[PDB]
Amino acid sequence: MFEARLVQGSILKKVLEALKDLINEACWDISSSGVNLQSMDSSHVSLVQLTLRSEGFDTYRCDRNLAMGVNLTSMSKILKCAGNEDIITLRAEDNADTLALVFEAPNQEKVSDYEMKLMDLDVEQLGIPEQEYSCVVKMPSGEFARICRDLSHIGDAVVISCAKDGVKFSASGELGNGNIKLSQTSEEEAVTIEMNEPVQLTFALRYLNFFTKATPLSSTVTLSMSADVPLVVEYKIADMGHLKYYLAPKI
Amino acid sequence: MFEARLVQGSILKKVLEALKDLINEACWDISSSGVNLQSMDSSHVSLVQLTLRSEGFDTYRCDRNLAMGVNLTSMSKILKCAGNEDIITLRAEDNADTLALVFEAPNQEKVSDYEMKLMDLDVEQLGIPEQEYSCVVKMPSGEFARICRDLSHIGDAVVISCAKDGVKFSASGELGNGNIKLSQTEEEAVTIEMNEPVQLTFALRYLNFFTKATPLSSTVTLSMSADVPLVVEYKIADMGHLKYYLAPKI
Amino acid sequence: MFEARLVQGSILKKVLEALKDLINEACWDISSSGVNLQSMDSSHVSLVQLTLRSEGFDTYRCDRNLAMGVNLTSMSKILKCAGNEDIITLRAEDNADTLALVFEAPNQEKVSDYEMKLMDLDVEQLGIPEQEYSCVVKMPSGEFARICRDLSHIGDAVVISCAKDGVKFSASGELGNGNIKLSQTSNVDKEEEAVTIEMNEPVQLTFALRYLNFFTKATPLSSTVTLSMSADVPLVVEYKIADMGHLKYYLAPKI
Amino acid sequence: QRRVTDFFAR
Amino acid sequence: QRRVTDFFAR
Amino acid sequence: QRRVTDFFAR
């Protein structure tokens, strides 16, 4: 069997909001070490990489490794039926092709208990090895969303330029063009830049907007860029795991 | 004439939100004893039964019994033009085919005053008798709405099963299926007066239209018996009640 | 050059909400006396008359008069990218066909800096002459919105009747009809919560609600609104922009 | 689905 | 619905 | 536009 219980249920609702809108299907890799999901969106331009360490669950049992194929829309519609304060427990009969979720209202004498069909899905995972990056920007996840949405009223693509001093997001449009300069600040409200060498890259906003759906998962977000290689937008899921989004640049 | 003044106006807005979406037309039965509306929705599957005792109005005059035929959509659009704190007064010239509503702002020395055409409608409705029921569940009206909406993401029809211990709402669907168990636990409480166990199946389509009454009451009571209609009763504190009847299946 | 800095940025966002939905294009008249916009909507039934006195800006430089042709939709989409507490600075190279806006977050971190293309706009502005009006009604701007929206559920057109006693908005419709009477108010506890009527002689006029609803988009600019009517001449719906200017809307009556 | 017409009558 | 065209000039 | 299927494999 596999059985994981999460006292802060809301984490799992917040996760499936971030994803359901970017990827319909996805293969959950269950193991001792915890829960790993990696998918590309249907365009093959963005890539999602969820990690929930087993450590960060109140209860975690898992006898064999599973590959649970989940329609994320189906699973979102179900987590919609879970209160934010609810204590969510996933359970999968190993010898079964269905996944059970149990929501206990933190009290007694109310218990929702849903059960969703699983599908076969080829976990052909991609390779992502961890790297030194040229620029890393840590900033409030709000301010990153606020920026990405605001430049969408201007242009299709944002140019992210990064120095020691600060970081500059730029968009050109039909109507005009616009520039947002964040400076580095001297506790999650802070903007900070670990910088090997300057980077300027262009990314589709279309996509960065789907990523900021993860904004209610973390105080802060970190952006890791290098010359002509994918942007990594990493939302920390405090004391539990992380949700990394990879976007390919242009020219 | 007939002339009733209601100091808590919001009650009358809250009522017409519950109804307007379920029934376009409806006959108001006016009398000494107060205001009685009973209608079925156009499908003949649900039935609404509003009662406002005359005693719960600040003023209440009514010379003979009337049958005022009201398009409830028309009357909703008008009560939308009444502030929540407003003091609503209905007035119908007996010798007239129009109904007047007057909204006095309790503060602002401002007074809205609308006037809406009535229609002829057969007041000759159904004879729902009062009954001992097998199960009665009292629960927060919020939690009943929260439940009915949540199972709508799953299935068409809910199965309401009722024991001593508690009550269980169950739905099957395309994507999966689910079960919500309330156990027995002033208005925050869940409680079950139970003669014998009942399990019945109802369309959620409809229970969702009923929960539009959820802002009328802290609590709702569900009364079921074997192969006879569910009664979803919203109390309208110290004024009357709004009972919804839904027929079960197979 | 021209360069104006406004410490309360939100005023300029609030303005462009009122306008953008009524008028796509519009010619801003810049001068030492300040910023003047006058446009009709494309139907020629309503007319907008914004004034922002130079006085009411924290900084105001302006060497020659400009006529900046602005697509207001474009300029709304840009002021949407300005936080409410942000310190907005307009700058226009006179010898340039672009207008620059700079939003400084008053606290910390960050400075947005947009730049929007201008258009050539020969706009025949009209000559509204100042007049004694028959009726003037000052009332809370909220209560005027609350009224205009409520009668929209009833009818197309409102009849505004005005005596010494009070003022009465009336609408007829398919479903029924309605009347809202405001009385004149002494015993308040707020100067802005009051309804008051300087009245030379009684007036009754008919106006399209379609339009009065676009006007009430200015409701977050002022505690109060004043209505000025006279027999067979336009209604003036005037929103005061405290210590800064005013936004006047003119609507033509019927028959 | 039964009709609620079926259980009670005029 | 008379218009403002015909109340003010140029 | 480019692909993120360009950097990482099996």
Author numbering:
A (entry chain A): 1 to 186, 191 to 255
B (entry chain C): 1 to 185, 191 to 255
C (entry chain B): 1 to 255
D (entry chain I), E (entry chain G), F (entry chain H): 4 to 13
Wording from the paper:
The CRL4Cdt2 ubiquitin ligase complex is an essential regulator of cell-cycle progression and genome stability, ubiquitinating substrates such as p21, Set8, and Cdt1, via a display of substrate degrons on proliferating cell nuclear antigens (PCNAs). In contrast, CRL4Cdt2 recognizes Cdt1 when bound to the proliferating cell nuclear antigen (PCNA) trimer, through a binding motif (PIP box) in its N-terminal end. Unexpectedly, we found a PIP box in the C-terminal end of Cdt2, and showed that it directly mediates interaction of Cdt2 with PCNA. X-ray crystallographic structures of PCNA bound to Cdt2PIP and Cdt1PIP show that the peptides occupy all three binding sites of the trimeric PCNA ring.
As Cdt1 is recruited to PCNA on chromatin during the S phase and after DNA damage through the Cdt1 N-terminal PIP box (residues 3–10), we then synthesized a Cdt1PIP-TAMRA (MEQRRVTDFFARRR) peptide, to compare its affinity with PCNA. Remarkably, the affinity of the Cdt1PIP peptide to PCNA (7, 200 ± 200 nM) is two orders of magnitude weaker than that for the Cdt2PIP, and similar to what is reported for other peptides derived, for example, from the pol-δ p66 and FEN1 (1–60 μM). To confirm the binding mode of the Cdt2PIP and Cdt1PIP peptides to PCNA, we determined the crystal structure of both complexes by X-ray crystallography, to a 3.5- and 3.4-Å resolution, respectively. PCNA adopts its well-characterized trimer conformation, with one peptide bound per monomer. The binding mode of both the peptides was very clear (see the Materials and Methods section for details). Both peptides bind in a similar manner to other PCNA complex structures. Some notable differences in the binding mode are the conserved Phe713/Phe11 side-chain ring that rotates 180 degrees between the two structures and the Tyr712/Phe10 that repositions so as to extend more towards a hydrophilic environment in Cdt2. The Ile709 and Val7 side chains occupy a similar space in the hydrophobic recognition pocket. Albeit the peptide main chain is in a very similar conformation between the structures, some of the other side chains adopt rather different conformations. The average buried area upon the binding of the Cdt2 peptide is 692 ± 6 Å2 and average calculated energy of binding is −13 ± 0.2 kcal·mol−1, whereas the average buried area upon the binding of the Cdt1 peptide is 650 ± 4 Å2 and average calculated energy of binding is −8.3 ± 0.5 kcal·mol−1; these confirm the tighter binding of the Cdt2 peptide to PCNA. In addition, weaker affinity of Cdt1 PIP box can help to release Cdt1 after poly-ubiquitination, whereas CRL4Cdt2 could remain on PCNA to trap the next substrate, leading to an efficient degradation cycle of substrates.
